[PDB]
């Protein structure tokens, strides 16, 4: 079942060269490459990188057939953070995921004047100040590293997973969700007040005897011990036929 | 005032509280060195290392029994004596730290003319001067005689004299 | 709008010196580290407040806001007129609001 | 204080005889670790057996302060201090802790300053009317569980002692014996104010021989 | 007083309305969208002033693509904006 | 009337508590979110094939991502922002107990311990904590000193004339006997046992002298983040390189942004060998490196087990050996400025592999002096002096896109997000802020410049449109489920 689905509904482009990875990624869930509303740009403010970014962006979308008047939303997030190098990316990512919860699109507010030579990139538009819309269905997040490292995400709204399960899943789900957020909230203000947030781990969830016996069973789980509260490896749940 | 060798209780409790970066109390003596560093298996055989040059004959399992034990195992065959790896911390002490001109000679001629402590009582206010690194560097020789001043009082506390 | 541009510059106009750099900078050639503009309208509305100072109270800020007001309005529209005439612009005025 | 009482032997001075037994008898250093221990049998004794129940029990089922909505920690505050039989709070102090309580939960979930909905603790002399005011302007009182700040000022509430004790074991902590024995006496001559208006929840003082 | 504070080096020049256009444009379409103006607003026809004032051909495309793919069906809002927008194209298309 | 007649007409104000969310992603009901989908997509997709981000945090000039997000979209901070921005500098904390007799519960001043009110934060600190945020000059103390105005050197100069003697100890003095050879003449003293040491003509001194450097300015973590107020220990502190505590800090921030408190937890629904780390840095710990080659030259009293706190996949061992305690993939990347872009790939790659089931991913990079000093001479980062020049303050030198760009702004922190199996976390309850449609890298082409950007990830968009007239029925999604 799992490799008909991987098949049809995960990896159906992987093989066919009339689909671009980039095409197939989005076809995955129905989007289009219109669907694509933000351009999380490394943007690093270096004359080479910002013209080079922006070109190669307005090449992909010119490929794709990406319609005309339909440009990417240029954000830039280093104007704010600045170039933290190796953490780069992840910090483009994290704003890339806020904008897809919240709709907003934060805008260069060191933009005072946008190079002339951008212009010439119908696909890309550069704004200034946030933006709320009606939603973002996709972020696109690129990095260039010294190195010829170059790199590209695509993250999707979460909301297109949600039409691939039941309602009762959902409802399910939904609810774990719901009660898991409540003790989340718990957690983060008691340790936030009682500077306990990072609480180091004294022992492993399995002895030293048990270990080896741990590691060599695929199906051993953690319960909670009754005494200590703490979740544990216990010796009946490995190579248990339950 | 009356010349008394350093006990190994002293020179032990320093060698251990120096190389963790903690005060001289901030470690109790009725402990064992695996309590004080049960983590890192790497610092643990470098101070069994560095007592082993300081004292020179080592016990078996030595990280296994209190500090106190310890102290009066070395403390019969130990004569007073700094012998290698303190006098190159006393050194290095002198050194790294005190403003020019500040040697440990001048060091040891100051709590002799200052406070009469003579040369086994010197070894051992030097030895409180190297628990309680002031870590920067005495800029001017005043700070370094009040430094000095501040470490004999704390290794007449310890020992139980008067000044 | 379309074709519009809006440079703009730090400026003291009771600096006779930052009067005639500055009319310098926007007649220069852009070679030269200048706009290579040709000033078709010059709005001097820059001023500082005055609250009682009665003829008796005359001072430093008063004789400073004059140059602001008066003296330097009149250098930089000698500035201009300098400038046009040296490049034989003569039929291009500047209005002066 | 540690001096002998002679009360009558009801399901609730028997679990008072065995906490004196196993728990109030222990040092210091060993309480907290033998409350954390027996947590789960101590609650469900306070809750079936004893005139001062565990506070946070949400319909039967034992909670703490932590795993409590605003809404229900209201409720459950009305629920022990209110008396619906003569429809009235049984001491006015425990209204103002009722008012303070909800006072809190209108400056946590307020945005902005505003004017509070309960004006007077007045008020609250009709207590549901007064909550569902409350969690009805801040509905989000009703689905977050106290933060922690709130857990620790509710405890402090609990202490104060210009105040009558409340009729309840809000945490099991080095206090719990204090939490337990104090204010003891007024329950038999007031039942109305008691959980399941149960006389064997209660103390009842009374001599071995004069009860012949 | 007379301390200069002029230098070249600090000029800064402001000329990219070409991008502004299509900022100003979208923040329109979306302050309609939420209803923060209305059809009631002067905020509506001094916006529409100022996009007319910059058209040309790739402001007049991303406009014909933003209006011509709004649901009118989603909401009042969303016609508001179709009707609007239908209506500031053909007034940009005028003044190109 | 007296003062009962006007005292009942006066009303009770209620000032706003900060509660801090931690912002989860809004479930809509079923029938709504079944709207966005096409039909057929349900039962198509192999959701153990769906990475999705169920977690995310970072440590940066903004504080916590909560804090950055409120000053990168709105500009400014609520109530909550400016409550978390002073806990994280250190400049409220909480009390509990007795203060000055009364009974006082909530935030105080950190230094003077005066109680201070949710709603007088914003008045009492923002100032200070807009100041000591983002983009700003580097401040010494935050860099062991460090100060661009004046970076130290040594100079090399041959001694014309003898010097006075120095007394030295018998080893120290040995050491420079050895050293210079027969341009120093050690002597012992007989009273005491030192040894006097005198450098001769033609030995070789090394002078201190300072040079005036032009990048002056940073992004920095705000002055008085500390790991401690996160509740990293003394004894971590002290072992660790900082940029180990932005990671650690980082890991259990967005563990809690997925939920799990308790990372034993995923034990509960995993094998300890599926839980992945593919978290990278460009350089590592830095503040090590330093140690080793600077710090260890100067006969400075550096810890002995320096090298292993340099090394790049440490940042990853020490979350592994203090939280996670995982037997599972360890694919550490070294990216540059795409390391967590690479992470991502490398961290969907291993999941497809299923060779894990959850990954952390992300990147950490610190600033130090000598990293600065380099990118200078590279002339990849901005002037700052130039930027005076042009009036500029810091908060306006990174402008990216912009006519008057000159190069980037250097900065320091992490940032984690934790990736999982789409069907592993509905089957944990954990939100679900993304889906990783995609994750690739590309390398560019034969050239001679190492820090060129090139074209090379165009390549994601390849695609043969000699044979476009007809559309393929692969693309789509009713062919692709009939075929299901
Ligand atoms: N000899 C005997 O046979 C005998 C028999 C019964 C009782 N007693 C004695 O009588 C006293 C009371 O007995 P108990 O069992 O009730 O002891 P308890 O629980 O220790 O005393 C009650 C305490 O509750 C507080 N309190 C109660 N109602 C209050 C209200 N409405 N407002 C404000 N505060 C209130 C008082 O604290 P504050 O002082 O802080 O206000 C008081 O100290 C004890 O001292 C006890 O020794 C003796």
Redesign the pocket.
Known sequence: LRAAQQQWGNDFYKRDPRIAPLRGALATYGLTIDDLGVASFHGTSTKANDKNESATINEMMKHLGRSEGNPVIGVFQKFLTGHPKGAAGAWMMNGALQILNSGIIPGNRNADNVDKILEQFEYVLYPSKTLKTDGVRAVSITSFGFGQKGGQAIVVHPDYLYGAITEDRYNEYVAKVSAREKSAYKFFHNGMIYNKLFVSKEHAPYTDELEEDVYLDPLARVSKDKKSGSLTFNSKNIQSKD | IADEPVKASLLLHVLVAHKLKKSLDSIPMSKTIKDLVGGKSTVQNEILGDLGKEFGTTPEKPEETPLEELAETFQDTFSGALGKQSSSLLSRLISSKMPGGFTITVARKYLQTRWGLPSGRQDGVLLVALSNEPAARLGSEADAKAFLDSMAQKYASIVGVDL | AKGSTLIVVPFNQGSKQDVEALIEFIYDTEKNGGLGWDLDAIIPFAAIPEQGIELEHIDSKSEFAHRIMLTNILRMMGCVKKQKSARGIETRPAQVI | ?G?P?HKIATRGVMLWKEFDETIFNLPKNKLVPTLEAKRDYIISRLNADFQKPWFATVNGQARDLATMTYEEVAKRLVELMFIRSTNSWF?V?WRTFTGDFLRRVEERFTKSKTLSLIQSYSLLDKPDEAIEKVFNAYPAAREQFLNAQDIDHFLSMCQN?????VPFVPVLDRRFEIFF??????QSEHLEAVVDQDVQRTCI?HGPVAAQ | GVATSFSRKKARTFDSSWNWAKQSLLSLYFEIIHGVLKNVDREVVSEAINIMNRSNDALIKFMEYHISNTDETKGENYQLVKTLGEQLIENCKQVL | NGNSADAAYAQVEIQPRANIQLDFPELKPYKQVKQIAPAELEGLLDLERVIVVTGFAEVGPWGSARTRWEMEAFGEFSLEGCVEMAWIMGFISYHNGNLKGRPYTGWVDSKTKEPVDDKDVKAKYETSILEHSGIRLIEPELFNGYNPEKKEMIQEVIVEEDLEPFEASKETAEQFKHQHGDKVDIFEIPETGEYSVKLLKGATLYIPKALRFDRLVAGQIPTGWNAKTYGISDDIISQVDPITLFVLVSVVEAFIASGITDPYEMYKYVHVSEVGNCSGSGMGGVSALRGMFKDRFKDEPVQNDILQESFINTMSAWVNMLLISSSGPIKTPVGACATSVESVDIGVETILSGKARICIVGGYDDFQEEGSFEFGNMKATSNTLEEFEHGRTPAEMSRPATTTRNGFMEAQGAGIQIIMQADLALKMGVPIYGIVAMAATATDKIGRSVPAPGKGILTTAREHHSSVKYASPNLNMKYRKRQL
């Open positions: 204080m001096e009482i001491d102090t002692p210009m105040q009558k004790p024995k104090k204010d003891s006496l007024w003082l």
